Amino acid sequence: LTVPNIPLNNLANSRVPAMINKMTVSTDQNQVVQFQNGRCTLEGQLLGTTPVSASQVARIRGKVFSTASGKGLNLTELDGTPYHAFESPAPLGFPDIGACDWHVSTFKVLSGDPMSRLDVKQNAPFAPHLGSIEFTSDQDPTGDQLGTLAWVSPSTSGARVDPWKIPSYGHLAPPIFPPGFGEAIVYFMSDFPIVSTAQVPCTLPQEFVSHFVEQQAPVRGEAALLHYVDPDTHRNLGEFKLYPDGFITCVPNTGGGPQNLPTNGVFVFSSWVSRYYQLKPV
Amino acid sequence: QLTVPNIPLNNLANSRVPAMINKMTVSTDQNQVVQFQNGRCTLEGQLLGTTPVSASQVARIRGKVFSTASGKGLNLTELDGTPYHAFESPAPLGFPDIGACDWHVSTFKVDNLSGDPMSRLDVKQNAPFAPHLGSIEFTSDQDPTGDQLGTLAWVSPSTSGARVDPWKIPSYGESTHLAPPIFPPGFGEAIVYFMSDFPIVSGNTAQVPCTLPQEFVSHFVEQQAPVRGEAALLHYVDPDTHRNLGEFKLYPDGFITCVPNTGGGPQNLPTNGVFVFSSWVSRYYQLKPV
Ligand SMILES: CC(=O)N[C@@H]1[C@@H](O[C@@H]2O[C@H](CO)[C@H](O)[C@H](O)[C@H]2O)[C@H](O[C@@H]2O[C@@H](C)[C@@H](O)[C@@H](O)[C@@H]2O)[C@@H](CO)O[C@H]1O
Ligand SMILES: CC(=O)N[C@@H]1[C@@H](O[C@@H]2O[C@H](CO)[C@H](O)[C@H](O)[C@H]2O)[C@H](O[C@@H]2O[C@@H](C)[C@@H](O)[C@@H](O)[C@@H]2O)[C@@H](CO)O[C@H]1O
Known part of the structure; x- marks a missing residue:
């Protein structure tokens, strides 16, 4: 060793x-x-x-889908392969900073500003073990988004x-x-x-x-x-x-x-x- | 042994x-x-x-914001905040090497945060781009001040x-x-x-x-x-x-x-x-x- x-x-x-x-x-x-x-x-x-x-470390990848109030991510592993709700708490590398809002900067896997900031709350719809989280964003992310935790609040x-x-x-x-x-x-x-x-x-x-x-x-x-x-x-x-x-x-x-x-x-x-x-x- | x-x-x-x-x-x-x-x-x-x-x-930048009559720049430091000395390196360690494009670098002020802490520094590789001597110019839609540390977010x-x-x-x-x-x-x-x-x-x-x-x-x-x-x-x-x-x-x-x-x-x-x-x-x- x-x-x-x-x-x-x-x-x-x-x-x-x-x-x-x-x-x-x-x-x-x-x-x-x-x-x-x-x-x-x-x-x-x-x-x-x-x-x-x-x-x-502290990265998220998923496909944008429509929720009751807006948008969410159907999570995948960071390499784009499917996430399986199994033995791990969440996809590998998923952030573990608890009890706070996350602000995650993602790009679609280009023209214009390619970045979206996904603002994620750890409330009821936050279900990373099941493979889904919700977000709000001032941008309009679609499809396969990959990104990194930018700051917390x-x-x-x-x-x-x-x-x-x-x-x-x-x-x-x-x-x-x-x-x-x-x-x-x-x-x-x-x-x-x-x-x-x-x-x-x-x-x-x-x-x-x-x-x-x-x-x-x-x-x-x-x-x-x-x-x-x-x-x-x-x-x-x-x-x-x-x-x-x-x-x-x-x-x-x-x-x-x-x-x-x-x-x-x-x-x-x-x-x-x-x-x-x-x-x-x- | 290797x-x-x-x-x-x-x-x-x-x-x-x-x-x-x-x-x-x-x-x-x-x-x-x-x-x-x-x-x-x-x-x-x-x-x-x-x-x-x-x-x-990798592909990170740190420096202190300064202003000129025409705009703003960063006086670069190493990523740990220690002084950057023009000696035998092209730039501070880890500085991005993606040439001939605009950079967009997301930074935060190191030390009591409130509001949105991020600034996107937009950097052009024109005349004031002089990282070997220890400074670059940027523009930003935000208001970065002081000791800014961050990461290359995208390029255009x-x-x-x-x-x-x-x-x-x-x-x-200039020898870099x-x-x-x-x-x-x-x-x-x-x-x-x-x-x-x-x-x-x-990019292609x-x-x-x-x-x-x-x-x-x-x-x-x-x-x-x-x-x-x-x-x-x-x-x-x-x-x-x-x-x-x-x-x-x-x-x-x-x-x-x-x-x-x-x-x-x-x-x-x-x-x-x-x-x-x-x-x-x-x-x-x-x-x-x-
Ligand atoms: C300052 C600014 O926001 N300008 C907008 C353009 O983005 C800049 O494009 C120039 C090159 O033309 C350079 O890459 C800067 O770094 C960008 O900020 C914007 O251009 C459009 O979006 C760009 C990201 C790029 O995809 C370009 O091909 C595209 O035309 C234009 C058009 O929306 O608006 C400018 O205000
Ligand atoms: C959604 C949004 O735009 N919120 C802005 C506020 O920031 C939110 O604060 C709440 C908790 O108060 C939560 O952390 C959200 O994740 C934040 O986006 C913003 O409040 C100011 O900035 C916050 C980050 C907060 O931490 C504090 O710094 C300050 O109250 C307000 C004020 O500009 O604007 C809201 O739009």
Whole structure:
């Protein structure tokens, strides 16, 4: 097993199309998350709606159809092949930013302005598991539309967007529980236009996901001990544990944590360790 | 030891636009020379041109809005906001390389958002287009200010009568330190182009070619493998049956070739195959047609 030999700031977010710009721990270190993207086991098994490429993250494709009030999308996979309402929560790569309006910029798969912005609410007709969502748009999209989540905003006036939530979809990756004993889940944060924190967290950089899928490495221990290394001085900046279920922890120093580390370090696999191997605080 | 990504073609990203690869092809003129600045990396992991590491850096722009007596522009930075220094690159890393057309780039202001946060920056590749020196002019129907970060959304012709040719690169300048041209390397070989659907208005097709899938680029950067021959022989393999569907050569300078059958080529291959490194071979190794 290896992890990507790529500095953190050259890694992509796995929940929105953006680069990672810092790490952090949650304000409540017992907080449980259940992100559906950026989920993959160390052996390379994708979970939830997680796709392989950073260019599949938080994208939607579907055929426009007429609903009672306007238009909707009958979803397909991003490659245009049919979506089958089966075991996954939604088509692969479907956004997982819950409890907010989405604004998705799509094109018809040209003359004039080719873009449509689809404004999607997560209310009753939002049924991505079944394969359909509704939208309003100031443009006139028709046919086969492919696009990318552009920004998010509150579901109702006065509400706030919490990008730590996931949608109700109508094989949902399981919750990630802080494993105890002072360890805290490490979240990888990206700037992203959120109207009304304005950073989106994820639990694995996208290139970690493709790395695990590509490598199909056997898991040889209860956790993988990683070092976060300065690529210029080659000094070890901190210890992290990578768990088989596909998330990373550290022991954050009180009043601090991985948010105080440089954002240009490289994670390097060091050794397999037991589940209760104690980390040096960071 | 050199490997290539164990990822099927349809799960690979384009290295010139933010899109997934949906097929391979060869150019209609098989002697056509290209000089793309993104998707460029040697087998030893040396990035060339403006090529970034991540698929989510591809064809993106960041900069600070400034005004002139005549209009507005962006003073470019790198995508992480750090200063862009004109040195040995054509532009900031990840900067689009779709030449000779108007660009339409959707940006947001980095940091307390209210209302519609997006601005569409309309960029012309005329005189004020000087990304190598670190600035471009734009017009916009919105009101972007401050630190704007965004992604190429679509492209359209420079003039009314014109077409978009996504096989061209910009004029970045003046010496701009371009990644060198890629010539078809002889022995009946044709460069393999990886295509993605993308909104090109008034292109002959709505597709953008690139010469390396983006995950190949990051793979080479990570691996930092030594080059041990004049070319790497690859097989394109069906992941279910494990059978070899065709021979390809991967060159040290960072591109892939095949010998296409007359009237055909890799465009006729299934799109769910995986490239696998086979062996190092001589420059003169003659490929079986595909
Ligand atoms: C449909 C539409 O055009 N709505 C505009 C408002 O934005 C909507 O806000 C609601 C919640 O209030 C919801 O997020 C929709 O998805 C938004 O499209 C707009 O409100 C202003 O901008 C919003 C994004 C909101 O977040 C806030 O910034 C502000 O109230 C109003 C005001 O210009 O115009 C509406 O047309
Ligand atoms: C500034 C503007 O919005 N102009 C509209 C034209 O779009 C511009 O076309 C020029 C080239 O003529 C260039 O591509 C700019 O980037 C565009 O913004 C528009 O042209 C029509 O739509 C274009 C996207 C393109 O498909 C063109 O072939 C087509 O004629 C014209 C016509 O609607 O209106 C202009 O106001």
